[PDB]
Amino acid sequence: MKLYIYDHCPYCLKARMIFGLKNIPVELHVLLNDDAETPTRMVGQKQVPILQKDDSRYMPESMDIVHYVDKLDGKPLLTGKRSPAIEEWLRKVNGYANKLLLPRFAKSAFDEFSTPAARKYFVDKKEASAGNFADLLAHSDGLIKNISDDLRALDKLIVKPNAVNGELSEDDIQLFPLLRNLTLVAGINWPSRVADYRDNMAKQTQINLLSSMAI
């Protein structure tokens, strides 16, 4: 029951969230980002989260972990009512968020980026390599407007400040992690019901907001 992760990783947030809500203890293991090799060895893919299930069985992928843990006790807690519109909106919002987040993930050096090596290794993937980030960063305010607007739409869509779709559904599994990531983007103007939802799920999951690291 061990999660090999890179703290910032949305998929790892999704994993930790499912464990949190289900209330299943899990050995979080924050690998250095430079350690791409061990993930690759274990699951034949450079990705984390990797769940070393009980009998030391390393399973990759958020959604897999989510559904598996959700089904572990034969009680589908949070697969109530999937909403396509929410899924679509989430994907679009991730599409934005990613671009804002990446350079913050670099600047606010998460634990996995402790070593200069891990930091550089991470930073060179997208942040430093795509010079365009300079421009996007300069443009931040305009992006903030776009994402905040898209969040106010989402703020209208939020049926309950816990169950996005009135019933706990995998849209929540995406949504809370996403908003949680967005806390790092200090500028993005988190709407009311969004913030309510977010802090409720944060409390439920025992996941700290990234406010303290936000820029």
Tokens representing 96 are 């934005």
- Separation between Cα atoms, residue 31 and residue 5, nearest integer Å: 6
- Asked whether residue 201 is assigned to any structural domain, the reply reads yes
Q: Cα separation of 188 and 145, whole Å? A: 7
Q: Which of 36, 67, 85 marks a domain boundary? A: 85
Task: Name 53's bridge partners.
Answer: 57
Number of domains in the chain: 2
DSSP string, 146-205: HHHHHHHHHHHH-SSSS-TBSB--HHHHHHHHHHHHHHTSTTS---HHHHHHHHHHHHHH
* Per-residue 3-state assignment (H helix, E strand, C coil) for 25-39: CCEEEECCCCCCHHH
Gyration radius of the chain's alpha carbons:
17
Strands 2-5 and 50-53: antiparallel
150 and 212 assigned to the same domain: yes
Domain co-membership, 44 together with 78: yes
Domain finish residue from 25, 60, 85: 85
d(Cα 148, Cα 179) in Å, to the nearest integer? 11
Residues 23, 43, single domain; the answer is: yes
Q: Residue 2 domain-assigned?
A: no
The answer to whether residues 80 and 152 belong to one domain is no
CA-nearest of 62, 143, 55 to 99 is 143
Q: What are residue 10's phi and psi, to 5 degrees? A: -45, -45
Burial (CB count within 10 angstroms: exposed 0-12, middle 13-18, buried 19+), residue 94: middle
CATH of the domain at 47: 3.40.30.10
DSSP state, residue 79: -
- What is the longest distance spanned by two Cα atoms in the chain? 49
Helix spans in 23-163 (H) = 37-43, 62-72, 84-107, 116-123, 132-157
Nearest residue to 180 (alpha-carbon basis) of 143, 206, 150, 149: 206
Select from 36, 177, 60, 186 the least CA-distant residue to 120. 36
Domain encompassing residue 205: 90-215
**10: enclosing H helix or E strand:** helix 10-22
Indicate whether 109 and 200 sit together in one domain. Answer: yes
User: Per residue in 58-72, is it b (16+ CB within 10 Å) or e — as a string?
Assistant: bebbbeebbbebbee
Q: Which of 19, 54, 85 is the last residue of a domain?
A: 85
What's the CA gap between 173 and 66, in Å, rounded? Answer: 8
